[PDB]
C-alpha cells in the first residue's frame, strides 16, 4: 500500500484591519459588530488590499524559501452561499503571492525529511451559521477576515509526517508572528486530500478530501481511519466515488457532508476592480533583513555552537 496525501492549510493572519475592509479582527461573542460598509457588500462599494497582509504574505514567502513572483492578480471564486456576502470569493487562481517552496519537517526515527509546498496565496473568509432557533442566523463577524491558503505539494506520505508538517507550519508561522496559532480560537485550520493506491498499479484509489480538522490528534486519527477505509474499499472493489468528507472525534467515523454530482464550476477570472500588486526585489530585500531566525535552525544552532542536548534545545526553541 502507498498512501499519498495532501494538505490545504488556512492560516488566519493577525492584522488589525481586514484585508479589504476597515473593521477589526479579534473579537468576542458580539455578532455583526465587525461589519462596516465594505463587509456588507453594498452596491457601488469597492475593496482595497491591506498593506501588512501582503507584507506578511511575502514574508512567509521569503521564510519558506520560495520564488516570489513580481506580479500577482486576485481572481474570483464565484459560488452562491449565505455566508458569502458577494457573489464571488476573492482568492488567487493564477499568479499567487507565494509559489513553490520547501519546509524542513522534523520527524522521529532518524532522518529529518523535507516536504514541498506548491503554493501559498491570499484568500477570504465567509460568514458563520449556528444551530438556532425555524430558520437560521448568519453572522458576518468573521467575514472579510484575511486568509492565507498554504497549499502543499503531495509529497507528504504517512499520517505522522502530516502531523509533523502541521506542527512545523504552526511553529514557523507563530515565529513569523503572522497567525496566533491557537487552533482553539479557530485561527489555524486545515484540510486533507488523502488518497491511497496499491504498489505496482497506478490504478484504483480515489481521492478523499476530509475537511475541518482541528487538533493534531484529530488529524492523525482521521487520516489513519481514512487510509484503512480506502484500503478496504479498494479491497472489496465496490464503488469508488469522489466526495468531500468530514471527521467527528466523538465516534471517530467519517461522515459525508455533500455528494459531488459534478465538478463545481467556480468560474475563475482576474478581478477587474483590483489591479495586480507589484512586489519588487527591494521589498524582499528589506523583509529578508527583517526575517527572524527560524526555530528549526535555531534549535540546531542551539545544538552546534552552544553546548546543549537535543531535548532541552528543542523545548527551549
Amino acid at each position: 500500500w502507498e498512501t499519498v496525501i495532501g494538505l490545504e492549510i488556512h492560516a488566519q493572519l493577525a492584522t488589525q484591519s481586514k484585508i479589504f475592509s476597515g473593521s477589526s479582527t479579534a473579537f468576542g461573542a458580539a455578532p455583526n459588530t465587525q461589519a462596516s460598509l465594505v463587509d456588507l457588500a453594498m452596491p457601488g462599494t469597492l475593496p482595497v488590499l491591506n498593506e501588512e497582509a501582503v507584507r506578511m504574505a511575502c514574508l512567509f514567502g521569503l521564510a519558506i524559501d520560495a520564488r516570489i513572483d513580481r506580479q500577482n492578480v486576485f481572481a474570483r471564486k464565484n459560488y452562491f452561499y449565505p455566508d458569502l456576502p458577494k457573489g464571488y470569493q476573492t482568492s488567487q487562481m493564477d499568479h499567487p503571492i507565494v509559489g513553490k517552496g520547501h519546509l524542513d519537517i522534523t520527524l522521529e526515527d532518524g532522518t529529518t525529511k523535507r516536504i514541498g509546498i506548491t503554493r501559498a496565496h491570499l484568500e477570504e473568509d465567509a460568514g458563520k451559521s449556528l444551530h438556532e432557533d425555524g430558520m437560521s442566523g448568519i453572522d458576518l463577524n468573521r467575514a472579510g477576515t484575511p486568509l492565507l491558503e498554504i497549499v502543499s505539494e503531495p509529497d507528504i506520505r504517512s499520517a505522522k509526517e502530516a502531523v509533523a508538517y502541521v506542527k512545523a507550519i504552526h511553529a514557523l508561522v507563530r515565529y513569523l508572528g503572522i497567525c496566533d496559532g491557537n487552533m482553539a480560537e479557530g485561527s489555524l485550520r486545515c484540510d486533507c486530500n488523502v488518497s491511497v493506491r496499491p504498489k505496482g498499479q497506478a490504478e484504483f484509489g480515489t481521492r478523499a478530501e476530509i475537511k475541518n480538522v482541528n487538533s493534531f490528534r484529530f488529524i492523525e486519527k482521521a487520516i489513519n481511519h481514512e487510509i484503512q477505509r480506502q484500503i478496504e474499499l479498494i479491497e472489496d472493489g465496490g464503488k469508488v466515488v469522489q466526495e468531500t468528507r468530514l471527521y467527528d472525534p466523538n465516534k471517530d467515523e467519517t461522515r459525508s457532508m455533500r455528494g459531488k454530482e459534478e465538478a463545481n464550476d467556480y468560474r475563475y477570472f482576474p478581478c477587474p476592480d483590483l489591479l495586480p500588486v507589484v512586489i519588487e526585489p527591494e521589498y524582499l530585500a528589506k523583509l529578508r533583513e527583517q526575517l527572524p531566525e527560524l526555530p528549526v535552525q535555531k534549535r540546531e544552532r542551539f545544538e552546534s555552537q552552544y553546548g546543549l542536548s537535543a531535548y532541552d534545545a528543542s523545548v527551549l526553541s
Binding site: M42, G44, N78, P85, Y88, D273
Partner: protein, 483 residues
C-alpha cells in the same frame, strides 16, 4: 424666462445679486412637476432635501466660499448612491433601496455648492441603449415624442435638452453617453479610465464603467469635470494625476493642429446625410485653421463583438451579489435557499439583463473561456495598440457618432440586432479607455445628430479646448422654446 439656464450665466447672475438659489430651484421644480409626466424623465423628486440644500446654498453663497459653481441645480443618475434617496438604477430588483452612504461624486459636488433636485430614469444597470427597457417607463425625446432620447443615459440628455436642467451626471460603459447626447444635440464628455472615481457608483462593467458629465455647452461640462475628477483612496482603479485646470484651457487657437479622419468611420453602415454633416464639420475645422490627415484602424470593425463578450462577463460577476439576502427586493414565498436565489434573481429584471448575464456566464464558463473572454481581451489589446500607434502623428481623431438617426418606439426593441448595430464607433474609446467627446453637428429630418472626437490619455483639456474653439463657429442656443 428662466429656461435659458447655464452654469456660467447662472453663476454670473447670482454674482450680480438677482435672487437666491431657493427662488431658482422652486421655479425650476415648478416647471419640472408640471411637464414631467409627458416625457417621464424623472423617477423621484425629493423636495425637502432640495429646499434644504437650496437654503444651505444661500447661506454658503452669502460668504461666497468654496467653488466656481455656487448653488448650481444638478441632478444625478440612479446609479450613484445617495444618502436618504432611493438608489435603484431603475430596476425592480434594487427598488425600495435607501442607501445608508452617499457617493464620492455626489458628496464632492454638494460640498462644492450644488443643489440636487432628484433622480432621472435610466436603463436597468446601464444595460441597453434605448431606455425602453425601463421598469418605470420608456423615456420620450424632446424633439420627437414618438422616438427615443437614447441610452443608457437617455433620461439625463432628455432632461437637459428639454430645458428642465442645466447640467446632469451621466455614465459611460459602452457608448452610453455619446449616443444620448447626439440624439438630443448635447455635449457629452468621457474622461480617461481612472480619472473619475467609482466609489458609490454601482458597477455594470468595472473595466469599462466611467462617470462623466452631460450638459449643453462644452464650458459647462468642463466646469463639472473640473470638479468631479480626481483621485479617491477608497477606490483602487483611481489614478493620481494633478491636471485639473480645464476652465483656463479655453480660448487656445487651433493653429496647425493635426486631425485624423479614419477610413473605417466611413463604411456601409452610416447614412450619407450624417456623412455630409461630418464633412461639413471637417471643412469648418479646416477653416478654423486645423490640418486633416487620413489615418487607419485595422481592428476597428472587430470592436463590436469583443465588447459584448467583456462587458456582459464582468456583469455576470458584478451582479452576482444581487441575491436579496442583505438588501433590495426579497421573494414573497422563499421555499428554499436555491429557490431564494433563483426566484429573487428571476424577479429582478426581465429579458435584457437576464440574457446578458447568461451570455456573460457562458463566456466565463469553463472551456469557452480561452475561446471567448481571453480572445476578446487580446482583441482589446490590439485595439489599444492601434490607438497608441495612430496617435503618434495625430493629436485628435474625429468621426461620426451614431450611424443611424433616432428610431421610433414599439419597433425593434425586442430585436437586439439593430440595438447592437447602433454602437459601432463609440465603443472603441471605451475598450481603449481613452477620453472622448460628442458634440452635435447639425440636424437630419428635424432630428439632431452629433460628431465624436477621441483624444489620448490624460489630456481632456485639449479636447474641450478644440470643443471651445468649435463653440465659436456655430451655436445652436435658441432651441429651448420649442422643447
Amino acid at each position: 424666462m428662466l429656461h435659458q439656464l447655464t452654469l456660467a450665466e447662472i453663476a454670473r447672475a447670482l454674482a450680480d445679486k438677482q435672487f437666491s438659489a431657493e427662488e431658482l430651484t422652486r421655479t425650476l421644480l415648478g416647471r419640472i412637476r408640471q411637464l414631467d409626466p409627458q416625457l417621464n424623465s424623472f423617477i423621484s423628486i425629493t423636495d425637502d432635501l432640495a429646499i434644504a440644500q437650496a437654503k444651505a446654498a444661500d447661506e454658503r453663497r452669502a460668504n461666497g466660499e468654496n467653488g466656481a459653481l455656487l448653488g448650481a441645480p444638478i441632478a444625478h443618475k440612479d446609479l450613484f448612491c445617495t444618502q436618504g434617496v432611493r438608489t435603484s438604477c431603475g430596476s425592480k430588483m434594487l427598488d425600495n433601496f435607501v442607501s445608508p452612504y452617499d457617493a464620492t461624486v455626489v458628496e464632492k459636488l454638494t460640498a462644492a455648492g450644488a443643489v440636487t433636485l432628484g433622480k432621472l430614469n435610466m436603463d436597468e444597470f446601464a444595460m441597453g441603449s434605448s431606455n425602453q427597457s425601463s421598469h418605470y417607463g420608456a423615456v420620450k425625446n424632446p424633439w420627437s415624442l414618438d422616438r427615443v432620447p437614447g441610452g443608457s443615459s437617455g433620461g439625463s440628455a432628455a432632461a437637459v435638452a428639454a430645458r428642465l436642467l442645466p447640467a446632469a451626471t451621466g455614465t459611460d460603459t459602452g457608448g452610453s453617453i455619446r449616443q444620448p447626447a447626439a440624439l438630443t444635440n448635447l455635449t457629452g464628455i468621457k474622461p480617461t479610465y481612472g480619472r473619475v472615481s467609482r466609489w458609490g457608483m454601482i458597477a455594470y462593467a468595472s473595466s469599462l464603467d466611467q462617470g462623466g458629465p452631460l450638459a449643453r455647452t462644452a464650458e459647462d461640462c468642463a466646469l463639472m469635470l473640473g470638479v468631479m475628477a480626481g483621485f479617491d483612496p477608497k477606490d483602487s482603479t483611481s489614478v493620481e494625476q494633478p491636471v485639473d485646470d480645464y476652465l483656463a484651457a479655453l480660448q487656445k487657437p487651433l493653429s496647425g493642429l493635426r486631425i485624423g479622419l479614419p477610413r473605417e468611420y466611413f463604411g456601409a453602415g452610416l447614412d450619407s446625410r450624417i456623412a455630409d454633416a461630418v464633412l461639413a464639420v471637417v471643412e469648418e475645422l479646416k477653416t478654423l485653421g486645423a490640418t486633416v490627415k487620413d489615418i487607419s484602424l485595422p481592428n476597428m470593425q472587430h470592436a463590436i463583438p469583443a465588447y459584448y463578450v467583456i462587458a456582459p462577463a464582468e456583469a455576470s460577476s458584478n451582479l452576482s451579489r444581487f441575491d436579496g439576502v442583505r438588501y433590495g427586493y426579497r421573494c414573497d414565498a422563499p421555499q428554499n435557499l436555491e429557490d431564494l436565489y433563483k426566484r429573487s434573481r428571476a424577479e429582478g429584471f426581465g429579458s435584457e439583463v437576464k440574457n446578458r448575464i447568461m451570455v456573460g456566464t457562458y463566456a466565463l464558463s469553463a472551456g469557452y473561456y480561452d475561446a471567448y473572454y481571453l480572445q476578446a481581451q487580446k482583441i482589446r489589446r490590439l485595439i489599444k495598440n492601434d490607438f497608441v500607434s495612430a496617435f503618434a502623428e495625430v493629436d485628435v481623431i474625429l468621426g461620426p457618432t451614431t450611424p443611424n438617426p433616432a428610431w421610433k418606439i414599439g419597433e425593434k426593441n425586442d430585436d437586439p440586432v439593430s440595438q447592437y448595430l447602433e454602437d459601432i464607433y463609440t465603443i472603441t474609446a471605451n475598450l481603449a479607455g481613452l477620453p472622448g467627446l460628442s458634440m452635435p453637428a447639425g440636424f437630419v429630418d428635424g432630428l439632431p445628430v452629433g460628431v465624436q472626437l477621441l483624444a489620448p490619455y490624460f489630456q481632456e483639456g485639449r479636447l474641450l479646448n478644440v470643443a471651445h474653439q468649435y463653440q465659436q463657429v456655430s451655436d445652436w442656443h435658441t432651441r429651448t422654446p420649442a422643447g
